[PDB]
């Protein structure tokens, strides 16, 4: 199984600040990385589809990029509604895995 | 025709399943749809 | 052909509709339809024939110190895929435009063929149809469709009815 | 629009089989050619994939649970189902169904989960 | 008495794109692109693949003790790792 | 449209010019112009849309004993550049030819639309214009441009003026 | 132009044939022919001009343990050859279709030019030719070919002969 | 259709020169741009190539016999010819003429022998 | 000179069986390999043109494939009329060579 490791496990930042969440795959997964936003009590929402593209309906403040093993999720101009857990998912192999998740707190 | 994600039973010139193949396969193309018109504009009245 | 086609026509692509004392109806123009079919069929086959078969191709492994080779190999595969995707999509768009233009020309040509035969024996309506200035039965309707209409035969009846 | 809705008892006793159903609407599980997923989240933990089923009934499972998991599909009703034998405390989780979509990419179809349902909480207790 | 010239129409919802116009509904069309697949590994023209299971190629050829079930596999249509 | 366009026409691509007792002038045919604009705009966008974005790409260093790799790397880059240059230039030439043909067709079609409405109520001049056989005011000029001209209304005046 | 060309015409591509009391014969329409030649010549040259020159290129040797490089090198060469073969053949098919359509348009345009000048001074036959309603000598035949035909001059003779 | 026909004495004495002629019909050895081959088969053995001649009179030979073999061509009659000096017992064989055709391929024209004639048996004896 | 070695020198098989004849080149000859069928008393017939293609008029039961040095001729559903010697020919170099030939007997 391809492991996904996220860092930090928890991050806090004020409104309007910039948040960078990173994820490292144990194996080369090319462009097969999705990012999800989980609000408490809800199923996760898709933010980022290809390592670098957004799902329609996702605010432009969200972006990301990456190569073989090293990927990044970035939130520009952080807003209160961005309070969420964020997850790193690989879709390269069959035993699909998610990272442990990063909790983003605001202020 | 066998690709890593499954076998293909097709006579069409292109596929959008996978670039790696073994056998006699359609060419892999990065597209969702590729369709030709043979008939008329379908405008009745 | 003006303001849409005929859903009541089922035996071809191009054709005629008529009205007389013996009853109205639709019939396809087989010469026009079959020539159009053969043209389009050859075109679709040419698109398929010029794209070759994909033969077995698999990836390659590279070492930690062979990153430059790995990157060139990927560059080559992505480049060729981007080119063939471009060519496949462009060819389809170019031919779809021509197909539709081809078909519009073919129906317009039947209209002119009829117009030419009828001359002064019918009134041009302006909706892609003609009204006779003489009484016309099924035999003369078939003659016009055949391309064998006898203009002189009805020219006297027509001038009298025209006034 | 596409909607998924999970449903089930919400409570299973130890050693019983848990059985959940997901009804798919606004889509067709006999026409799309997509994979249908089941995933779960244990309270306080991140997400864990359970398995998926394709249109042809082809089924795959998370290998750590493959001996317990059964996944099936009924196209007539647009329903997916999940069954876990020998249920224990470790199986308390919110269970979700999801649709896996794709866009062709370099290297093949690039898959993602877009429609995730609502989530059904299942407690294992006596 | 009249003669009208026209053409065929039907209930098709197939659409195509052209250079000048998008989403044109047409009476007949051809799909040149295949998107279905049988999401299983099949035999090719009657011959099964060699599955390496949990083994890498190095495991398979060196004879890793756990690649035992492959020592008797002499032929294949393809190899799956 | 015969022997050049009108520099006095500024509100569109295709249109009409008229002369009567109430004063002459030019006006664009907006249905023709806007359909032509939309067609051409979609075409330009398709050319742009089918060419993808260039993403970061840099060169590679090679050693003294890696000349074969250096040469393959260069070969790949030159090959892809030569292909894309070819495709970009060819697409532009092919579409520029069609654009101009498209526009000539559109102006010719307005002429025929007018010709069809006027029938025997005007003399065809042969320079892409018509001369009325009846007196015509601004309201009938607008009617012809609209495609609502009433032929029967003036057929008596015309036959008398024709002789 | 209907039912085949004239093997008796040797001084151009498009032209006229005439019959009168002074003797029949054929002559090419040089303006039409030369414009057609220049158009086609430019097109052939564009096909040649957009394909570049092949410069020296030779193969490479690889070792026993360089099979991955050997295979990439071959892949690159086969890929580029398959692409250029596709482009060369497609361009020729696309242009051959347009050439023939171009030529059909040009002959049809001469017909319409003549039709426009003659108006009611000749009977349209329906085979791509006209029959005069007045006696016509070599000078008026040349005038029609020139595009300088004087319609009014013969309108009285014509109405009397038409009846 | 393309036909090749070999002809010659069928018997040559030792130390004489053997001379065979192949008449080509249904084709043109001045227009095709193809290579024209001579081959032979010793009884009980497989096939051995002798040599070939091109349209420009360019001639090549099997190097083991190059000092003995002469190949020529007369376009006026569509005829090919083969001569072997110093003939011996080892030269008993069925001699054949053949046309070499081609289809362009990756790596250049891919050549093959399609029209092979009938074959003339030549015995060397006294 | 590039040597062509065929194997076996002789093969027998019953009608309806499958016959595989192989040939190995001493040098890389790419796709330049032809296969011929020689009936006793006749000039050889071309079966296979490119290593993988057939000559028009050749029954569909014949096929073949190959790479640089290793090539195969295969006869599916062997029929009595397939009794013949088969030859492996390379057309890569100038001193054209044939393999020694394989005699295919039926039953
Ligand atoms: C799909 O497989 C069936 C046999 O199961 C065959 O009859 C059919 O022709 C195949 N289809 C294609 C190329 O659509
Ligand atoms: C992989 O290893 C596990 C653990 O020993 C075993 O249960 C499984 O059957 C093995 N897989 C294969 C394909 O042999």
PDB file of N, CA and C in Angstrom, chain G residues 31-103:
ATOM      1  N   UNK G  31      -9.011  35.079 -68.788  1.00  0.00           N
ATOM      2  CA  UNK G  31      -9.003  35.624 -67.445  1.00  0.00           C
ATOM      3  C   UNK G  31      -9.346  34.537 -66.441  1.00  0.00           C
ATOM      4  N   UNK G  32     -10.327  33.696 -66.770  1.00  0.00           N
ATOM      5  CA  UNK G  32     -10.713  32.631 -65.861  1.00  0.00           C
ATOM      6  C   UNK G  32      -9.607  31.606 -65.722  1.00  0.00           C
ATOM      7  N   UNK G  33      -9.005  31.219 -66.849  1.00  0.00           N
ATOM      8  CA  UNK G  33      -7.965  30.219 -66.815  1.00  0.00           C
ATOM      9  C   UNK G  33      -6.753  30.695 -66.073  1.00  0.00           C
ATOM     10  N   UNK G  34      -6.310  31.922 -66.314  1.00  0.00           N
ATOM     11  CA  UNK G  34      -5.104  32.353 -65.663  1.00  0.00           C
ATOM     12  C   UNK G  34      -5.332  32.592 -64.189  1.00  0.00           C
ATOM     13  N   UNK G  35      -6.524  33.025 -63.786  1.00  0.00           N
ATOM     14  CA  UNK G  35      -6.714  33.193 -62.364  1.00  0.00           C
ATOM     15  C   UNK G  35      -6.712  31.826 -61.700  1.00  0.00           C
ATOM     16  N   UNK G  36      -7.301  30.825 -62.368  1.00  0.00           N
ATOM     17  CA  UNK G  36      -7.316  29.487 -61.821  1.00  0.00           C
ATOM     18  C   UNK G  36      -5.910  28.915 -61.720  1.00  0.00           C
ATOM     19  N   UNK G  37      -5.066  29.182 -62.716  1.00  0.00           N
ATOM     20  CA  UNK G  37      -3.709  28.682 -62.685  1.00  0.00           C
ATOM     21  C   UNK G  37      -2.943  29.297 -61.563  1.00  0.00           C
ATOM     22  N   UNK G  38      -3.058  30.602 -61.384  1.00  0.00           N
ATOM     23  CA  UNK G  38      -2.292  31.238 -60.344  1.00  0.00           C
ATOM     24  C   UNK G  38      -2.708  30.749 -58.973  1.00  0.00           C
ATOM     25  N   UNK G  39      -4.004  30.522 -58.769  1.00  0.00           N
ATOM     26  CA  UNK G  39      -4.481  30.040 -57.483  1.00  0.00           C
ATOM     27  C   UNK G  39      -3.911  28.665 -57.178  1.00  0.00           C
ATOM     28  N   UNK G  40      -4.017  27.767 -58.139  1.00  0.00           N
ATOM     29  CA  UNK G  40      -3.544  26.420 -57.934  1.00  0.00           C
ATOM     30  C   UNK G  40      -2.033  26.368 -57.773  1.00  0.00           C
ATOM     31  N   UNK G  41      -1.294  27.152 -58.549  1.00  0.00           N
ATOM     32  CA  UNK G  41       0.148  27.150 -58.431  1.00  0.00           C
ATOM     33  C   UNK G  41       0.557  27.598 -57.042  1.00  0.00           C
ATOM     34  N   UNK G  42      -0.083  28.645 -56.502  1.00  0.00           N
ATOM     35  CA  UNK G  42       0.295  29.102 -55.179  1.00  0.00           C
ATOM     36  C   UNK G  42       0.046  28.016 -54.159  1.00  0.00           C
ATOM     37  N   UNK G  43      -1.059  27.292 -54.303  1.00  0.00           N
ATOM     38  CA  UNK G  43      -1.401  26.211 -53.395  1.00  0.00           C
ATOM     39  C   UNK G  43      -0.372  25.084 -53.396  1.00  0.00           C
ATOM     40  N   UNK G  44       0.083  24.670 -54.580  1.00  0.00           N
ATOM     41  CA  UNK G  44       1.060  23.593 -54.635  1.00  0.00           C
ATOM     42  C   UNK G  44       2.335  24.064 -53.976  1.00  0.00           C
ATOM     43  N   UNK G  45       2.726  25.304 -54.251  1.00  0.00           N
ATOM     44  CA  UNK G  45       3.935  25.802 -53.657  1.00  0.00           C
ATOM     45  C   UNK G  45       3.806  25.894 -52.150  1.00  0.00           C
ATOM     46  N   UNK G  46       2.636  26.254 -51.609  1.00  0.00           N
ATOM     47  CA  UNK G  46       2.481  26.319 -50.156  1.00  0.00           C
ATOM     48  C   UNK G  46       2.673  24.941 -49.529  1.00  0.00           C
ATOM     49  N   UNK G  47       2.203  23.892 -50.199  1.00  0.00           N
ATOM     50  CA  UNK G  47       2.390  22.554 -49.656  1.00  0.00           C
ATOM     51  C   UNK G  47       3.868  22.226 -49.557  1.00  0.00           C
ATOM     52  N   UNK G  48       4.611  22.546 -50.596  1.00  0.00           N
ATOM     53  CA  UNK G  48       6.034  22.292 -50.607  1.00  0.00           C
ATOM     54  C   UNK G  48       6.779  23.171 -49.600  1.00  0.00           C
ATOM     55  N   UNK G  49       6.464  24.457 -49.559  1.00  0.00           N
ATOM     56  CA  UNK G  49       7.127  25.430 -48.700  1.00  0.00           C
ATOM     57  C   UNK G  49       6.976  25.146 -47.218  1.00  0.00           C
ATOM     58  N   UNK G  50       5.862  24.560 -46.795  1.00  0.00           N
ATOM     59  CA  UNK G  50       5.688  24.301 -45.375  1.00  0.00           C
ATOM     60  C   UNK G  50       6.337  23.012 -44.887  1.00  0.00           C
ATOM     61  N   UNK G  51       6.898  22.217 -45.785  1.00  0.00           N
ATOM     62  CA  UNK G  51       7.581  21.009 -45.372  1.00  0.00           C
ATOM     63  C   UNK G  51       9.055  21.356 -45.457  1.00  0.00           C
ATOM     64  N   UNK G  52       9.809  21.144 -44.392  1.00  0.00           N
ATOM     65  CA  UNK G  52      11.196  21.560 -44.476  1.00  0.00           C
ATOM     66  C   UNK G  52      12.102  20.515 -45.106  1.00  0.00           C
ATOM     67  N   UNK G  53      13.374  20.879 -45.259  1.00  0.00           N
ATOM     68  CA  UNK G  53      14.419  20.036 -45.834  1.00  0.00           C
ATOM     69  C   UNK G  53      14.901  19.019 -44.833  1.00  0.00           C
ATOM     70  N   UNK G  54      15.171  17.801 -45.299  1.00  0.00           N
ATOM     71  CA  UNK G  54      15.728  16.816 -44.416  1.00  0.00           C
ATOM     72  C   UNK G  54      17.233  16.953 -44.457  1.00  0.00           C
ATOM     73  N   UNK G  55      17.796  17.083 -43.282  1.00  0.00           N
ATOM     74  CA  UNK G  55      19.214  17.262 -43.111  1.00  0.00           C
ATOM     75  C   UNK G  55      19.807  15.980 -42.639  1.00  0.00           C
ATOM     76  N   UNK G  56      21.114  15.865 -42.775  1.00  0.00           N
ATOM     77  CA  UNK G  56      21.782  14.647 -42.430  1.00  0.00           C
ATOM     78  C   UNK G  56      21.388  14.105 -41.087  1.00  0.00           C
ATOM     79  N   UNK G  57      21.041  12.828 -41.122  1.00  0.00           N
ATOM     80  CA  UNK G  57      20.642  12.075 -39.960  1.00  0.00           C
ATOM     81  C   UNK G  57      21.024  10.633 -40.176  1.00  0.00           C
ATOM     82  N   UNK G  58      21.723  10.087 -39.203  1.00  0.00           N
ATOM     83  CA  UNK G  58      22.199   8.722 -39.244  1.00  0.00           C
ATOM     84  C   UNK G  58      21.804   8.016 -37.965  1.00  0.00           C
ATOM     85  N   UNK G  59      21.923   6.694 -37.935  1.00  0.00           N
ATOM     86  CA  UNK G  59      21.556   5.953 -36.735  1.00  0.00           C
ATOM     87  C   UNK G  59      22.658   5.924 -35.686  1.00  0.00           C
ATOM     88  N   UNK G  60      22.376   5.237 -34.583  1.00  0.00           N
ATOM     89  CA  UNK G  60      23.278   5.112 -33.448  1.00  0.00           C
ATOM     90  C   UNK G  60      23.432   3.684 -33.023  1.00  0.00           C
ATOM     91  N   UNK G  61      24.615   3.344 -32.541  1.00  0.00           N
ATOM     92  CA  UNK G  61      24.823   2.031 -31.985  1.00  0.00           C
ATOM     93  C   UNK G  61      24.610   2.082 -30.506  1.00  0.00           C
ATOM     94  N   UNK G  62      24.139   0.969 -29.962  1.00  0.00           N
ATOM     95  CA  UNK G  62      23.905   0.807 -28.541  1.00  0.00           C
ATOM     96  C   UNK G  62      24.534  -0.486 -28.070  1.00  0.00           C
ATOM     97  N   UNK G  63      24.873  -0.542 -26.806  1.00  0.00           N
ATOM     98  CA  UNK G  63      25.491  -1.718 -26.230  1.00  0.00           C
ATOM     99  C   UNK G  63      24.439  -2.748 -25.817  1.00  0.00           C
ATOM    100  N   UNK G  64      24.878  -3.884 -25.296  1.00  0.00           N
ATOM    101  CA  UNK G  64      23.968  -4.936 -24.859  1.00  0.00           C
ATOM    102  C   UNK G  64      23.148  -4.514 -23.665  1.00  0.00           C
ATOM    103  N   UNK G  65      23.738  -3.676 -22.841  1.00  0.00           N
ATOM    104  CA  UNK G  65      23.131  -3.192 -21.626  1.00  0.00           C
ATOM    105  C   UNK G  65      22.577  -1.801 -21.791  1.00  0.00           C
ATOM    106  N   UNK G  66      22.321  -1.402 -23.029  1.00  0.00           N
ATOM    107  CA  UNK G  66      21.713  -0.121 -23.306  1.00  0.00           C
ATOM    108  C   UNK G  66      20.435  -0.291 -24.089  1.00  0.00           C
ATOM    109  N   UNK G  67      19.737  -1.389 -23.859  1.00  0.00           N
ATOM    110  CA  UNK G  67      18.527  -1.672 -24.598  1.00  0.00           C
ATOM    111  C   UNK G  67      17.455  -0.649 -24.331  1.00  0.00           C
ATOM    112  N   UNK G  68      17.379  -0.118 -23.126  1.00  0.00           N
ATOM    113  CA  UNK G  68      16.340   0.879 -22.915  1.00  0.00           C
ATOM    114  C   UNK G  68      16.575   2.127 -23.782  1.00  0.00           C
ATOM    115  N   UNK G  69      17.846   2.520 -24.000  1.00  0.00           N
ATOM    116  CA  UNK G  69      18.132   3.685 -24.841  1.00  0.00           C
ATOM    117  C   UNK G  69      17.848   3.384 -26.280  1.00  0.00           C
ATOM    118  N   UNK G  70      18.170   2.171 -26.696  1.00  0.00           N
ATOM    119  CA  UNK G  70      17.941   1.778 -28.057  1.00  0.00           C
ATOM    120  C   UNK G  70      16.478   1.832 -28.359  1.00  0.00           C
ATOM    121  N   UNK G  71      15.660   1.343 -27.435  1.00  0.00           N
ATOM    122  CA  UNK G  71      14.244   1.347 -27.663  1.00  0.00           C
ATOM    123  C   UNK G  71      13.663   2.738 -27.646  1.00  0.00           C
ATOM    124  N   UNK G  72      14.172   3.641 -26.811  1.00  0.00           N
ATOM    125  CA  UNK G  72      13.638   4.987 -26.849  1.00  0.00           C
ATOM    126  C   UNK G  72      14.013   5.668 -28.142  1.00  0.00           C
ATOM    127  N   UNK G  73      15.242   5.481 -28.600  1.00  0.00           N
ATOM    128  CA  UNK G  73      15.682   6.108 -29.823  1.00  0.00           C
ATOM    129  C   UNK G  73      14.806   5.668 -30.973  1.00  0.00           C
ATOM    130  N   UNK G  74      14.520   4.369 -31.050  1.00  0.00           N
ATOM    131  CA  UNK G  74      13.686   3.885 -32.121  1.00  0.00           C
ATOM    132  C   UNK G  74      12.289   4.446 -31.991  1.00  0.00           C
ATOM    133  N   UNK G  75      11.751   4.481 -30.780  1.00  0.00           N
ATOM    134  CA  UNK G  75      10.416   4.991 -30.562  1.00  0.00           C
ATOM    135  C   UNK G  75      10.280   6.403 -31.080  1.00  0.00           C
ATOM    136  N   UNK G  76      11.289   7.229 -30.838  1.00  0.00           N
ATOM    137  CA  UNK G  76      11.259   8.599 -31.289  1.00  0.00           C
ATOM    138  C   UNK G  76      11.253   8.669 -32.802  1.00  0.00           C
ATOM    139  N   UNK G  77      12.104   7.891 -33.463  1.00  0.00           N
ATOM    140  CA  UNK G  77      12.135   7.925 -34.915  1.00  0.00           C
ATOM    141  C   UNK G  77      10.864   7.418 -35.555  1.00  0.00           C
ATOM    142  N   UNK G  78      10.270   6.379 -34.989  1.00  0.00           N
ATOM    143  CA  UNK G  78       9.077   5.829 -35.584  1.00  0.00           C
ATOM    144  C   UNK G  78       7.923   6.768 -35.359  1.00  0.00           C
ATOM    145  N   UNK G  79       7.879   7.396 -34.199  1.00  0.00           N
ATOM    146  CA  UNK G  79       6.817   8.318 -33.882  1.00  0.00           C
ATOM    147  C   UNK G  79       6.819   9.500 -34.824  1.00  0.00           C
ATOM    148  N   UNK G  80       7.980  10.102 -35.050  1.00  0.00           N
ATOM    149  CA  UNK G  80       8.036  11.253 -35.923  1.00  0.00           C
ATOM    150  C   UNK G  80       7.715  10.873 -37.352  1.00  0.00           C
ATOM    151  N   UNK G  81       8.158   9.710 -37.803  1.00  0.00           N
ATOM    152  CA  UNK G  81       7.853   9.302 -39.153  1.00  0.00           C
ATOM    153  C   UNK G  81       6.366   9.066 -39.333  1.00  0.00           C
ATOM    154  N   UNK G  82       5.709   8.449 -38.351  1.00  0.00           N
ATOM    155  CA  UNK G  82       4.289   8.165 -38.450  1.00  0.00           C
ATOM    156  C   UNK G  82       3.501   9.478 -38.485  1.00  0.00           C
ATOM    157  N   UNK G  83       3.947  10.480 -37.727  1.00  0.00           N
ATOM    158  CA  UNK G  83       3.284  11.774 -37.729  1.00  0.00           C
ATOM    159  C   UNK G  83       3.452  12.501 -39.041  1.00  0.00           C
ATOM    160  N   UNK G  84       4.658  12.538 -39.589  1.00  0.00           N
ATOM    161  CA  UNK G  84       4.831  13.249 -40.836  1.00  0.00           C
ATOM    162  C   UNK G  84       4.181  12.561 -42.002  1.00  0.00           C
ATOM    163  N   UNK G  85       4.071  11.239 -41.968  1.00  0.00           N
ATOM    164  CA  UNK G  85       3.401  10.550 -43.046  1.00  0.00           C
ATOM    165  C   UNK G  85       1.953  10.947 -43.002  1.00  0.00           C
ATOM    166  N   UNK G  86       1.372  10.959 -41.806  1.00  0.00           N
ATOM    167  CA  UNK G  86       0.001  11.367 -41.639  1.00  0.00           C
ATOM    168  C   UNK G  86      -0.215  12.763 -42.163  1.00  0.00           C
ATOM    169  N   UNK G  87       0.640  13.705 -41.772  1.00  0.00           N
ATOM    170  CA  UNK G  87       0.437  15.066 -42.203  1.00  0.00           C
ATOM    171  C   UNK G  87       0.569  15.238 -43.700  1.00  0.00           C
ATOM    172  N   UNK G  88       1.535  14.569 -44.322  1.00  0.00           N
ATOM    173  CA  UNK G  88       1.712  14.728 -45.751  1.00  0.00           C
ATOM    174  C   UNK G  88       0.537  14.196 -46.542  1.00  0.00           C
ATOM    175  N   UNK G  89       0.019  13.035 -46.147  1.00  0.00           N
ATOM    176  CA  UNK G  89      -1.081  12.450 -46.873  1.00  0.00           C
ATOM    177  C   UNK G  89      -2.366  13.190 -46.637  1.00  0.00           C
ATOM    178  N   UNK G  90      -2.591  13.654 -45.415  1.00  0.00           N
ATOM    179  CA  UNK G  90      -3.817  14.355 -45.150  1.00  0.00           C
ATOM    180  C   UNK G  90      -3.855  15.659 -45.893  1.00  0.00           C
ATOM    181  N   UNK G  91      -2.746  16.381 -45.938  1.00  0.00           N
ATOM    182  CA  UNK G  91      -2.755  17.642 -46.631  1.00  0.00           C
ATOM    183  C   UNK G  91      -3.060  17.449 -48.097  1.00  0.00           C
ATOM    184  N   UNK G  92      -2.488  16.436 -48.722  1.00  0.00           N
ATOM    185  CA  UNK G  92      -2.789  16.219 -50.113  1.00  0.00           C
ATOM    186  C   UNK G  92      -4.249  15.873 -50.328  1.00  0.00           C
ATOM    187  N   UNK G  93      -4.846  15.023 -49.499  1.00  0.00           N
ATOM    188  CA  UNK G  93      -6.250  14.714 -49.734  1.00  0.00           C
ATOM    189  C   UNK G  93      -7.135  15.931 -49.564  1.00  0.00           C
ATOM    190  N   UNK G  94      -6.838  16.764 -48.573  1.00  0.00           N
ATOM    191  CA  UNK G  94      -7.666  17.928 -48.332  1.00  0.00           C
ATOM    192  C   UNK G  94      -7.583  18.922 -49.474  1.00  0.00           C
ATOM    193  N   UNK G  95      -6.389  19.105 -50.020  1.00  0.00           N
ATOM    194  CA  UNK G  95      -6.259  20.043 -51.096  1.00  0.00           C
ATOM    195  C   UNK G  95      -6.767  19.498 -52.411  1.00  0.00           C
ATOM    196  N   UNK G  96      -6.695  18.188 -52.639  1.00  0.00           N
ATOM    197  CA  UNK G  96      -7.216  17.689 -53.889  1.00  0.00           C
ATOM    198  C   UNK G  96      -8.715  17.882 -53.939  1.00  0.00           C
ATOM    199  N   UNK G  97      -9.396  17.719 -52.804  1.00  0.00           N
ATOM    200  CA  UNK G  97     -10.828  17.945 -52.808  1.00  0.00           C
ATOM    201  C   UNK G  97     -11.136  19.394 -53.129  1.00  0.00           C
ATOM    202  N   UNK G  98     -10.417  20.325 -52.500  1.00  0.00           N
ATOM    203  CA  UNK G  98     -10.694  21.721 -52.772  1.00  0.00           C
ATOM    204  C   UNK G  98     -10.388  22.126 -54.196  1.00  0.00           C
ATOM    205  N   UNK G  99      -9.347  21.567 -54.795  1.00  0.00           N
ATOM    206  CA  UNK G  99      -9.010  21.915 -56.165  1.00  0.00           C
ATOM    207  C   UNK G  99     -10.127  21.597 -57.095  1.00  0.00           C
ATOM    208  N   UNK G 100     -10.690  20.422 -56.954  1.00  0.00           N
ATOM    209  CA  UNK G 100     -11.725  20.071 -57.872  1.00  0.00           C
ATOM    210  C   UNK G 100     -12.956  20.939 -57.646  1.00  0.00           C
ATOM    211  N   UNK G 101     -13.267  21.286 -56.389  1.00  0.00           N
ATOM    212  CA  UNK G 101     -14.434  22.130 -56.143  1.00  0.00           C
ATOM    213  C   UNK G 101     -14.234  23.534 -56.722  1.00  0.00           C
ATOM    214  N   UNK G 102     -13.007  24.031 -56.628  1.00  0.00           N
ATOM    215  CA  UNK G 102     -12.587  25.325 -57.139  1.00  0.00           C
ATOM    216  C   UNK G 102     -12.841  25.393 -58.624  1.00  0.00           C
ATOM    217  N   UNK G 103     -12.410  24.368 -59.332  1.00  0.00           N
ATOM    218  CA  UNK G 103     -12.591  24.362 -60.757  1.00  0.00           C
ATOM    219  C   UNK G 103     -14.061  24.279 -61.163  1.00  0.00           C
TER     220      UNK G 103
END
